[PDB]
Structure formats: C-alpha cells, structure tokens
A paper describes a structure:
Glutamine synthetases (GS) are central enzymes essential for the nitrogen metabolism across all domains of life. It has been proposed, that GlnA1 is directly activated under N starvation by the high intracellular concentrations of the metabolite 2-OG.
The 2.39 Å cryo-EM structure of the dodecameric complex in the presence of 12.5 mM 2-OG demonstrated that 2-OG is binding between two monomers. The detailed structural analysis uncovered that GlnA1 assembles into a dodecamer characterized by stacked hexamer rings. A closer inspection of the density reveals the density for the bound 2-OG at an allosteric site localized at the interface between two GlnA1 protomers in vicinity of the GlnA1 catalytic site. R172’ and S189’ coordinate the γ-Carboxy-group. Notably, F24 stabilizes the 2-OG via stacking with its phenyl ring. R87' and its loop undergo a dramatic flip to coordinate 2-OG and D170 of helix α3 (residues 167–181). Notably, helix α3 shifts forward, causing F184 to flip over and facilitate a T-shaped aromatic interaction with F202. The resulting pull on F202 causes F204 to flip, allowing π-stacking with the purine moiety of ATP. The conformation of our 2-OG-bound dodecamer resembled the transition state conformation (ADP-Met-Sox-bound complex) reported by Schumacher et al., even though in our case no ATP was added.
Author numbering:
A (entry chain D), B (entry chain O), C (entry chain C), D (entry chain Y): 2 to 447
The structure:
C-alpha cells in the first residue's frame, strides 16, 4: 500500500528520501524466533548497505560467545518496509538482515541462514517452496501500567459477530497496517476461543513467508498495544479453551508447475505429494521441539478433541496431523497443523522443507489416510491403526530432537546445540516449580 | 503409655470397659494410603469383633465397583488404641482392620493384605522384616476458616533452637500423643527446611510399622490442628527449600539373628545384605510410582543437591539412594531414601521387601558403592560410573510400573490396575493445566 | 537455683528422675556460633550417655561433608541444666555435648574442641584462663506473627529508670531464668542505646564461660520471646545509637594465684600481664574476623566515639582496645572490648587465650599505654603514636585471617577453612547488594 | 540541525539575534562531573563575552573556599547551543565556559582545564585524542510529584522490539534533541537490562567529546522528564540486572594519521597502540576512583559475568578490560570498558589520555592478550595468567588514587585533593550505614 516493494538498495534509498524516512530499524531474528531490532539514522543507511551494521552478538541468545562477539548485519533491501504505526513525519522503516561474521562469512547460527540453506537444498532438486501460514492470536487487556494480562477482551466464539466479537476495530487496524507492510490479507475473523482471532494473509515463497510471520507477529503486537490491548501468540494462555496454532500450508514447485498436483491420479495428488507427506510424518517427532518450542506448546498439544497430536494424514479430516485442502492445480498444498505461533518460522519452515525433501528423495510412503475422527478413537483403536503420537511435553521433544541426525544436519551444529541448550535450561527451570495446582490438589490431602 | 497393648479381643473389651471408651473408630487404609474411618459405639464392638463391620466399598478409591460394593472390615485387636486428643470421658478409640469380601475371603485390593502377602513371602524363606521410617512433615498456619495454608510457622533450619524453631510445643504434644498410642519416640527436631520437623519413633515389624506410619500421619495432623496449625506431609509444598521424604530403614531377621550382619566380613555386612541392596536397586525404578506417588513427589525428586534421585548405594554417603548406617549387630539396617511421606506405607514396604527378597533369591550383585558426592558429579561422570536415575516425573514412573511384572506380582492385579488407573487420571489432569509459571515466562514474550 | 550442678552422669540421671524430666535437649554449637539442638526422651538418656547421640552433620554449617556425614554427640554431664521457661511437669532439660566422629575420635571442626585444645595448650604452660564476658543485647518488639523487628521497646539510656526503661520485668525474668540455669547474676541495667540492656553474670573457667555465653544468648532470647519481645544480639541493629559488644575480661591463673597480679610492681601488674596484652595486641587483627564475625560487626566497629577500633591498651581508658580494671589480687583481669555478641565464644575465647599465651611465650612488649581519649585524637596524632586500627570491614578481617598462621594453628585446618569459606560467601553476597542508601544518594543526582 | 555550529562570539551573537534567543544558560562542570548552570539574558551576552560571568565558587563542590570565592566563567563560543526542549519563542541557549580566577588566570580546579592540560600534553608529543563514548542509561517512572523512582518502564532486553521495548518514543525524541544540539546519532537501542537504553553518537575530539558527554546526560534527562520519565545514569540502580557503563573508545592521531594503525603489522596495530594499552593497564587501578566515582559503581563492578573488573586487553573479547574493535585505518580505536556514566568525563578522559601517553613515552608493553572468557576462569587460572583486578570498592580505589603520583600530576593538586576529600566523605558516610540487607540476614539469627 502506497509504497512499491523495493528490490535493490537504490530503491530503498529513493524510498527513504521520498517518504521522509529518518529512522531505520535494522532487524534480525534470534535462535528462538524473537525479533531483534535497533535503530540507525537514515543518513547512515548508505554506509550500512555497504559495510553492514556492526553489533554485539554475545547479548543475543543462541549467537556467538563473549570472547568472539562482534557481528555484522547485512541488510536485505527487499525487506525494506515503513512502519505505519510510527509517525509519518520523520518516518520509521525496518530492514531485515542476514547475520554475518566479521570475516565476511554468514553466521551459521542465523535462523534465516538455516532457511536459506534449506531453500538451496530444495533448489538443488529443482524445487521451490511456497508457505501459507495461518496464525492464531489472543487479544488480552493491559493493566494500568500497560503490561500484558490474560484478561479476556470478549467472550465470542468462532465466526462471531455483534458485540460478541469486540475486536473488529483492532483487526481492521491490523489489516490496514499489514497491507501497508506489503501483506495481502485474505480473511480475518474471531476464532474458537474467547478473545482469539485469526488474520490470514496470502502465501508466498518460504523466505518471504517466514519474514512475513515475524513481521506479522510484531505488527499485530504493536497495533494491539497502541489500542490498549495485548496481542498474545502464546500457544495456550488459558485452560479449557482453544489454543493458538500456526497451520502451515506448504506447496512445492518445479518448472513453474505445482509439484503436488497430478491431474491423472484419482485423488489429484502426485506421488511426490505422498512422498512429501511421508517424510513429514516420519520426521515430525524429531523437530516437534522446533515447531512447538515452549512448555506451553504441550499445554496446547494435549490428547483430546482440539490438538493435532496424532501423527496421520488425510484430505478433509481436521483431526489429523496433515490436512490436504481440496484446492487443486497451482493451489495444491499440504497443511501441517501441529506448530504454534511461538515457533521460529525460519527453523520450522526449513525443517518441514527438509523433511518433505527427504521423503521425496527416499520415496517414503505416507501410509493410508485416516478419514475418521481420531479424537473419538480410543487408544486401542489408534494402536491398531498404527497412529503414533507427537511428544507429550517439551522434555520428550528435546530428547527426540537430540538423537535426530536429520534435525542436526538440517539446522547445523550451532543452531542445533544452542537451541537444545536453551530448551534444556527452560525445561530444567520448569520441572522444579511447585505449581499452585499441586497445592490445591495435595496440600489438604497429604 | 498408661494402656498396655491389647493382643486379643477380650483385652480390647476389658480396656473399653475400664477406660470409659464409648466410640470405636473402625479404620483401614485405602489404595492410595489415605486412612478411612467411621465410628461405631463401643456397645457394638462385641458384635463387630465376630461379624465384622459392614461398609460400602464403591465410595473408596481403588476398592470394589458399585455393582458388588458390600464390604466387611475384620477388626485386628492388636491395633486397638485410644486417641488422646479426644475426650477422656466417653473416650474415643481406634481399631485398624482388614478388608474382607462378604464371602469371607480377604479383599485382594487391601494394601494391608498386600503387605501381609509380602510378609508371608518373606516367612516362606525364613525372613522377617523390621522397618524404621523417618518421616518429615511441615507445620503451616491455618487460615481464618481453619483450612490448610502454606504459610510458614518459623524460619528455622536444621537442629535450630530458640524462637528460630517455633514448634517445640507442637512437637512436645505430638510426642505425648504418640507415646499414648504406643509409639516409642527416639528423637524430635526441626528439619532443614523452614517450618519442617522430624519426629523419630522406634522401629518394629513391618506390618506394625506401616500401621504406625498411617497412625503417625493422622496423629500429627490432629495434634497440629488442635493447636491451630496444619501438618503437611506433602513431598514438596514449597519451592527452593528442602522437601519431605520418608527414609525407610529396613532389616531382615532369621532365627533371631540380623540377616544383614556378618562379623567375619571386612565391612561387617553379609552377602544377603548386598543381595537385598542389589534387588532394591534393580527394582526401585519399577515402584518409584509407589514410593513417590504424586506429581509433587517429583518436584521433590529433582536432580540437584538434596534429592536421592541417583540409583546407587553407599555406607556413609547421603547423596546415595541407599545408605548403610554404621550400626552393626542386631541394628544392621539398609536405608532407602527415595520415598516421601505421601506414599502408601503398606504397598511401599511390601515392594521394598519383595525387591530385597528377589535380590536375595537371585543373588543380585549391587555393584561397587558410590562413596563420592554424586550431587557434585556431572552427567558425564555419572554416566561413566553407570549411575542411573529415578523416573523424572510421575508419568515416567507410571510407565516404568506398568511394564513391571515384579510390581504386578507383588501388588496383585487389583491393586496394580487400580493404582495405575488413579495415577494415570492424576497425571492426565495435571498435564493439561496451564500454570502461572508459564504465564510469567511466556505471556509477555510470545 | 534449686538444682545442684551435676558432675557425673549418675547425678544427671538422678536429677532427671527426681525433677520429672522427660525431654533432653542434646545441644552443641556449630562453627559460626549458633546453638544446635534436638530433643531425645529422658528414657533414652542412659543409652545416649554410653553410645552418644547420632546425628547428620552435613546439614550443619562448617561440619562434615555429605559423603561422610554421620556424627556422634558425646554428652557432657556437667552441662546438664533444666530449662525454666519450659513446663515443670514433664520437664525439659538441656545437655551440651562434644561432637565426635564415628570412629571415636573428636571432631576437629567442633568449636568446643578448639577451646579445649586452647585450654590444654594453656595447661601445658601451667595456666588456667578465667573469662568474664559482658554481653549487650537489644529488646525489640514482635510483629503480629511473632517475628523479629527492630521496633524500639523504650527510649531509655544508660542506667535509666522509671518508664524510661520499660524492660525491668523482662530483665527480672531473664535473671530468674539464668539463676535457674546456674548463672550467678552480678548486675543488670539499661544500656546506652535505646531498648539496649546489659545483664552481667559471674566469671568462670573459660570452657564453662563459653557454655554460659551460648546458654545466656538462647535463654535471653527465649525469655524475651515468651514476654512478646525479641532479644537481638546483633552488633549494630540500629544506626546512630550504640552497638552491642561483648567485652571479654580474662584472667590467667597458675598454682592458685592470679598470674596478672604482682604486688611489687608500681602498677600492680605482672610482666606476664604485659606479655599477655602484647600478644593480644599483636594478634587481634588476625582474628578480628572471629571476634567480629558478621558484616554488621563493622557497622558497629566504625571510627568514631563509641567503637574500640584502635589497637591500644590502658588502665582506665575506655577508648582503648584493651582495658585493665583497677581490681587487683585474684580479681586482676584484662578486658578486650572489640568483640560483639555475634561471635562464637569458643573460637573467640580460644583465640584470645592463644594470643596471650604467644605473648607470654615470646615475651611480647605491649608498648606504652594510651591514657588519652583516642576518639578525640586525629589520624595524624594516632599515626605519630603508632596506634593501629582494626580491620574496617569483614573483607579486610577475612584477608587478615587468611594470612595468619597463628589463627590457622589455633583453630585447626577444618575450622579455619570452613569459617573463612562461610565468611567469604557472606561477604560476596553482601558486596553485590544495591542498598537503599545508594538509591537515596545517587538516583536523583546521576 | 538547523543551526550551524558557531566558532566565534560574532557567530553566537548573530545566532542569538536571528533565532530569537533570550536566555543564555552559562554552564560549567564541577569537580564531580555535575553540570552547573545559571541563566543570563541575551542582552548581557555581549558583556559576558568580554568580561566573563562572575559567580560564587564557594557553593560549588571542589571549587574555591569561602574566603576567596569570587570566580569568573569565560564563555566558549564554539559550545553555543540552543536547547530544543525549551520554547522556541524567546529561545533558551546554553554556552559552556572555562572557570577563571579574578586575576585572569584559569582555575586549576576546573575539570575542563584538566582536560585541556592533558590535550596540551598530548600535543607536545604531536598527538591528538579522539574519544567515542558509549553511554547506557535507565528509563524509570516518575512518582506523583515528578521525583525519580526505580520503577521499570519495560521488561525488555538487548535489541528488543514490539511493546517489549516501551521507550521508542523517548529514544526518538532524545535523538531529535541531540541532533538539534549538534550530535550525530549513530545507533539507538534497548540495552540488556530492563528499562535500559543506549544511544550512540559519533566520536570527536576529546574536549568536544567530554562536552558532548555532559550535554548528552542533561539532554537525555530533560527529554525523559518532559515525557514523564526519569533518565538514570546511575551505575547500578537495580540488583540482578546489568549495570550502566560508559565504554570509552579512544584513538590517537598524528599528522592526520591514526597512530594506532599499522598496515605492516600482522594484527594491523602499531607498536604505539600496544604502548597506549600498556599505559592504560598499568595506571587504570590508580584512577578507577575517577572512572568509577561512586559507591554504586562497584556494585556494578563486581566479579561475575558482566563487569570488566579484570585488568586485561584483547581484540574481540568483551570480558577484557580493554577491547580493540576490528575497525582499522582511521577508525582504529581502543575501548576502555570499566567506566560508568557517573564519572566526570573531563577528568576520566584526561586520565586515560595521560595513561596512554605515559605508556607510549615509557614503552610499556601490555603483555599477551587474553582471548578466553575471563568470567568463566577461576581465581587460580586468573592468578596463573597474572590477570589483576580493579579495586573492589570505592575505598580501595580511593586508597589506590591516594598513592598515585601519576594521577596527582595529571589532575593537579587542587582537583586531586578536593576529589579525594569528597570521595572520602562519601565513603565515610556510606560505611556506617546499617543496611536493610543486614537486618534481613542477621536480625532473626543473632
Ligand atoms: O472484523 C474484522 O476482521 C476487521 C475488518 C472489518 O470488517 C471492519 O473494519 O469492521
Ligand atoms: O522440641 C521438641 O521436639 C519437643 C520436646 C521438648 O523438648 C519440649 O517439650 O520442649
Ligand atoms: O531491672 C532489672 O534489671 C530487673 C530486676 C529488678 O530490679 C526487678 O525485678 O524490677
Ligand atoms: O527506537 C528508537 O531508538 C527511536 C528511533 C525510532 O526508530 C523511532 O522513531 O521509533
């Protein structure tokens, strides 16, 4: 909206000049998926495009150590975007960058570098990945200090209207801001859980899509904050209601044609689509710790009637792990329903790409589709069907990822080790906490 | 104290007559270790000694189903005891009983029956078990309604005096009450954690010891309640301070001689003592779910510098799972340090007895003792020494117990299945709870 | 009072029988001077007198490690005393003990053992030390929960009467209790600071005197607690008013004669008295960390007009480190004014004894006495007189103690190392704290 | 911005006339680094440029005595700057000045005079100093009366975005104001600690740089105040989070060439750079009391994992005292990381310049660089490498500065004596305070 997407640094400089841009937010994503930002003046942008932007990486989790901590951000001109919630006079813009070592080599601990490596691996087989993510978030009230709470903003449900849904203005302003940041909005609605909302944007290439995921998260948070609300991408902030997931629709392309499409097959799906699904189902347990990164992710991913915890695929069944929407042609896609919006999109999308590529290369059969309600099935029926489960908690997923040579190869040694160390520290802190539930259950019994 | 221990029902009736006993609390222990009590008049005691006391078992957890729920309690006269905190005029007494089916057979789901079966198994090899348990409990404040809290009664530490320890009167009254119930007090002190106390009573035969454990728990709770306090036997009611365990000292006897003693050996320990330790260490993972029954038990049993989570044995080392106090002769005993006071003493003591008997029968070598501080060791050093760990949470211990044929054989099918079902329901409820820790950690990040 | 002091275990057993003693508090002092107590029944006292009382030493600070943590307390019958604030029916008594290793050897980390070693060293030269300590304490209010505060109980001053001093009843009950515990009270009064009081008891042999110091501290604390007050032995609980010290009057005896007395000298002081003063003045900097153990001790020991921070000796001058009261004959004594009631009396008295013995053995001249008000002197005047200062804070005293071979020899390796480690941890925690004084001084200015 | 930097008094008068400037804030820096300001009308500015501005120096700390207290401020036209937060109509401008005695001689107690003396000393050897300081500050809430607090404005961390960082508007307005006051902003971001922010401006000549440091501090404070916040340059306002330092990047120049650069050397550093580092490392202990002036500075400078307390140098290691950024050519610089923003920039920069000049003149070898994480090293490993430590507290640094003839020569007798006297009074007041930490630690124990 009102600003054509720049491709080169010259277009970025012209846009900075003509849109009265004064501050440039040089941005990158850390290992755990948190956006890292610092502001440089627009006068320094020409020097930043040539020499990079130097920063200390020892204060960034998963990055370099304190002994060798100097790092450089190489700005990507195509990611240049003006923030619409910032003032228009002396405008503020963001540029995403790639993290580099001072010797000119890319930082292998950069998640964007991991996604680029997965993209290069796909291109070596002639494949290009398109990802359409569906992010759910909660809008909660802020307290008197403007700090986040879990207080509900409405008691609405799925597709609710009227004053049952009380965030039409917030979703409207989010949609406007996203269109200003180059998003193509498709739909926006109230989700199943109270105060839960989904805003769908158009799919794109996987690198641009992961950039869009981190951008979408911080844009939604900023717009919610300026209206007096808090936007939460916690997987399960509230008990008893629906959690927030990130349904990941993915499609493969080769020579301009959708790889997953085959008009000759009765199901209109190619053998390569089945191989991609088989690789995803084979490897999903090994990087559930990445697609579902936090302890709360497994408060969302509990067996029940909501969470895609059962490893399976189907066409229309929404109780299966993998869903294949009936769209055919260039729109043929595979939806992974396990991940939540707390995951690092670069690492998660890279790992799904690598799992699908491994399935295609090794010709992994996905098995028979599960067309029944797996939630209504019992453990005996699921055991007879061979329907396995995702890791039940963060420790189990850490253990699954630790022994995975596939995840270690796909992520690189730095990302693998630092991610596992951070998750291990998080679980070790969590596992010692005496929760109020235990006091309510045991104190007056024991 | 003041009442000689009755052995026959005639002695019980004489004591009821001469001590003005009006109410008899017929008591038993349920599957999870909770004392179950109801009061009959002393006039009905003569009929209750011949026909038993009939009760409904469908309202007792782990007991019979609602279709066949009539149950009979067969009173054991040796357990007759007058409660000292109850009024002396129209005195109140308790009798423990064995649960029987209406057809005259013992209820196989009775934990006391399980312990008696373990005792019979030991006697078939000529062994008799003596157990000395060391129970820790917390003394918390009561609220305005007299309900339990976790509010500290003092900030004292181990062996603290003065007003640093603020429960000398409560411990004094508990000691008096326990001596009235036939306990032989050995020591009483403030424990390591704030508001934590240990009262040690003399060892005895394992059946009387388990009776003493349940009696001690409810006596401490009653005495604390009448002084305006709450006695908590929760394994870990507070974070950051010491949890409460139940160190289980056990000794075996045959022909009047301590089996674990051997004056000829350099370490003054018989080969049967080593076999008992080997069986305990081999099987302890399979009934950690019994010795540590609740979710909070594994908030106590965390790797660190306090909890005996590492499967090992030693003589003086208190970082080992099994300790051998230097007492020899008839006082030679083996101390298991994993269990907490929330466990069912009948099932726990029966399982330790059966594990030790399996070790003696199969000549299981316990391996080399670990004389170093295992807490100061790293995971690499513990892996090099082969030092295994106890189950990290209740789910892992449930899984370990489920596949154990030893635990299933020792407990019987009814106790095994009902205990596992109750623990599974407990963990399934716990695992879905969104804790305030997750809100504090993730809400303003995600 | 009413109970003649027992000397043998038979006398103790007779006193237990005839005074209805039911609970025995087996007591000892840890490395930092804190009384450690646990209660055994009086029925176990005969066995405890023969085999000792076993306890875990790993939970006691400065004691053994967790790998070899079994310890035995050898009860001292002469220390047997009935606590008067405890009920008379089912009376409670205390017995102090010596800590022994299980192999029958004394524990070298026991402070009582350190004092006994100092006594043996003095006896090898024919000397016996008598110590008269003068303890000051504060009387503060209890809060609603009965926890310590610093709220003043009165605004009185030195030797104040009327309702200016509001603790005549507390001092009266303390005096009664102390007389019941074998103390010979000499005087009791309100001290200089508000809510500050001094109760003087008769001197005695140094081992009995240190026993009396720890006994006095916990007796005063208990009596204050039962009247709704808190007795604080903090060196400096309040700023701007007088701190609490422990003036240590010491006298040496040989062949029944006071060593420090000489009727032929003009000052009526023997050369051995001057040698003792010289040794004390030479070594006092090396164990100031023992006589003044905590950080708050040096908030008392600040240069000013109250604290004896200047290393000097004199006869009547109370601004000197060492004061010689004009009493002569058998009452000739040397008063060390630096220590506070927070010190371990066993270690402190042992170190003063060893410093004086080193002065006598090495013939150390104490120099000229300082008969002027050293507080009114300037730093230049004190520098010309050669008047050195005590360590300014706990860190400086720790550093002085570290390099002292005299203190290491006098305390033994275990006590030296563990005491220094505890003090180092205490100072390392203290030195990082951002105090509210810094916020008041710097926040609005920097 | 919008006002070209004046060089002569004629340019200042023209700017005053054309910008409607009515009030001139004649400003100077006192001995401890606090800006001292008073307002004269712009009509008096022509007379002030000729005769100076008379003021009373007895009310300024570190300045003249009350007997001879008349002082004159000689205005520096190059420092003329219009304050942007003051009204534009009847504009308010500042002029920095040099403090002079009435006899026309410069006041030797003026810190700006000390820096000018250091500059003259450097120019006598042909050197010119360029300093780039990196200042960290905290943004705290104001109370109801607009007084400073320590209440956090956000819980963000290093390089945080979104509403995690809640001070983008404050940083934006600070950047605008600094650009108005002649600063060239380079970067601005949220720092590691919560509510902590860093704004980087371009380096310059050392005199202009120290002027910029004091200007930056009061500009940040004014802008924060007008938005309802408090800007704190306190070294360690909060415990457990990162403190605020002032990393001092310095470069030397001779004949237009960076002295520290040498293309022939393998490390691209001249021998003079090593000499400068050696002089800095040799003398840093002697003026740590200047670079770290307050008691709180050593609550920041504690051994740990954050503070540069270990005397060492390296290239990329951020655990070293001295860092050498990889920039070469004219950008070669040496970063001293010990100082905090509470220091007097004139005295601090003068002392770093003099230490480096002494290193160059005396050919002081800096030793081997320390390329390992010194924070992860133990005291034994640091002692084997000869890695010394900075003074642990303000008293130790005062004692180090007392015996330094280098600091006395570099600062002059007046500044040296008055600075030491002020620091001595500060420490003497601090050392007597009974802190609440001591009450929490000792009151219930002693
Ligand atoms: O309801 C929404 O999703 C926001 C868009 C909209 O329809 C509106 O502006 O009300
Ligand atoms: O302190 C205790 O353990 C209770 C027994 C006792 O010594 C007392 O009565 O005070
Ligand atoms: O005032 C005192 O020290 C207590 C003793 C006394 O004189 C009294 O009982 O009032
Ligand atoms: O965030 C900042 O450092 C302030 C500058 C900026 O980017 C803005 O105006 O938002």
């Amino acid at each position: 909206v009102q600003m054509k997407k720049c491709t080169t640094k010259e277009d970025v400089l012209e846009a900075v000049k003509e849109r009265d841009v004064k501050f440039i937010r040089t941005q990158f994503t850390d290992t755990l998926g948190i956006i890292k930002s610092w502001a440089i003046p627009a006068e320094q942008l020409e020097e930043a495009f040539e020499n990079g932007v130097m920063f200390d990486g020892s204060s960034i989790q998963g990055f370099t150590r304190i002994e060798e901590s100097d790092m450089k951000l190489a700005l990507d001109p195509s990611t240049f975007r003006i923030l619409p919630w910032r003032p228009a006079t002396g405008a503020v813009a963001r540029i995403l960058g790639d993290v580099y070592l001072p010797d000119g080599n890319p930082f292998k601990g950069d998640p964007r570098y991991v996604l680029k490596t997965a993209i290069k691996e796909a291109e070596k087989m002639g494949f290009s990945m398109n990802v359409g993510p569906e992010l759910e978030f909660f809008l909660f009230k802020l307290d008197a200090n403007g700090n986040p709470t879990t207080e509900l903003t409405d008691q609405g449900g799925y597709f609710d209207f009227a004053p049952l849904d009380r965030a039409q203005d917030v979703r409207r302003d989010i949609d406007y801001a996203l269109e200003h940041m180059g998003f193509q909005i498709e739909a926006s609605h109230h989700e199943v859980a109270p105060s839960q909302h989904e805003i769908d944007f158009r799919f794109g290439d996987v690198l641009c899509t992961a950039d869009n995921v981190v951008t979408f998260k911080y844009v939604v948070k900023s717009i919610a904050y300026h209206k007096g609300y808090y936007a939460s991408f916690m997987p399960k902030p509230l008990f008893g209601v629906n959690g927030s997931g990130m349904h990941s629709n993915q499609s493969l392309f080769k020579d301009g044609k959708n790889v997953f499409y085959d008009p000759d097959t009765p199901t209109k799906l190619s053998q390569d689509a089945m191989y991609y699904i088989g690789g995803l189902l084979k490897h999903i347990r090994e990087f559930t710790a990445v697609t579902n990164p936090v302890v709360n992710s497994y408060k969302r991913l509990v067996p029940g009637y909501e969470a895609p915890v059962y490893i399976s695929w189907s066409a229309q069944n929404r109780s299966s792990l993998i869903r294949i929407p009936a769209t055919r042609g260039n729109g043929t896609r595979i939806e992974l329903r396990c991940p939540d919006p707390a995951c690092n999109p670069y690492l998660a999308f890279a790992l799904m790409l690598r799992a699908g590529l491994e399935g295609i290369k090794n010709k992994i059969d996905p098995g028979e589709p599960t067309n029944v309600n797996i939630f209504h099935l019992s453990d005996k029926e699921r055991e007879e069907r061979g329907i396995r489960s995702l890791p039940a908690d963060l420790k189990e997923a850490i253990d699954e990822m630790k022994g995975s040579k596939f995840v270690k190869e796909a992520l690189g040694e730095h990302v693998f080790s630092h991610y596992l160390c951070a998750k291990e520290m998080e679980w070790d802190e969590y596992k010692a906490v005496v929760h109020p539930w235990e006091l309510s259950r045991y104190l007056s019994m024991l």
